[PDB]
Amino acid sequence: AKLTIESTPFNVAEGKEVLLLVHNLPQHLFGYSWYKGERVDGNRQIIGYVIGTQQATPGPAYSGREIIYPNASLLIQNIIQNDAGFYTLHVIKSDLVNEEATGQFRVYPEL
């Protein structure tokens, strides 16, 4: 019942893509804020996304390789080792009962 992130695949080949799937999204949504690391921290913000206007805006940690989906799921393309680690989603609601979840993935080289 709780907001959760699941990476697919959990172990990712360099040069390939990972999808951070988002489950149990709440109602009353204004939009989404994604971060590298285990907490909400503006210095590590990848991207912000407003549902009503469909506008995505890069944060300080934006790489240009990300795609955000309407249900908050986040894809990262052309993966490098440095991408490995934790990713945190903050869901901003009109009632400010904002929800947070964290997921992770690992990276491996190929050939």
Q: Which does 48 bind (CB under 5 to 8 A by kind): Cl ion, a second copy, none?
A: a second copy
- Determine which residue in the list 9, 15, 42, 70 makes contact with a second copy, applying CB under 8 A: 42
95 in contact with a second copy (CB under 8 A): yes
Phi-psi region for residue 83, left (φ > 0), alpha (ψ -120 to 50) or beta?
Answer: alpha
Q: Which is nearer to a second copy, 40 or 80 (CB)?
A: 40
Bridge-based pairing of strands 11-13 and 99-108 is parallel
Question: In this structure, are residues 22 and 102 in contact, taking their beta carbons and an 8 Å threshold?
Answer: no
Q: What are phi and psi of 12, to 5 degrees?
A: -115, 130
Six-digit token string for 42: 């503006």
- Residue (5 or 12) nearer to a second copy, CB: 5
Does residue 73 interact with a second copy by CB under 8 A?
no
Residues that bind a second copy (CB under 8 A): 30-33, 39-42, 45, 47-50, 55, 57-59, 90, 92-100
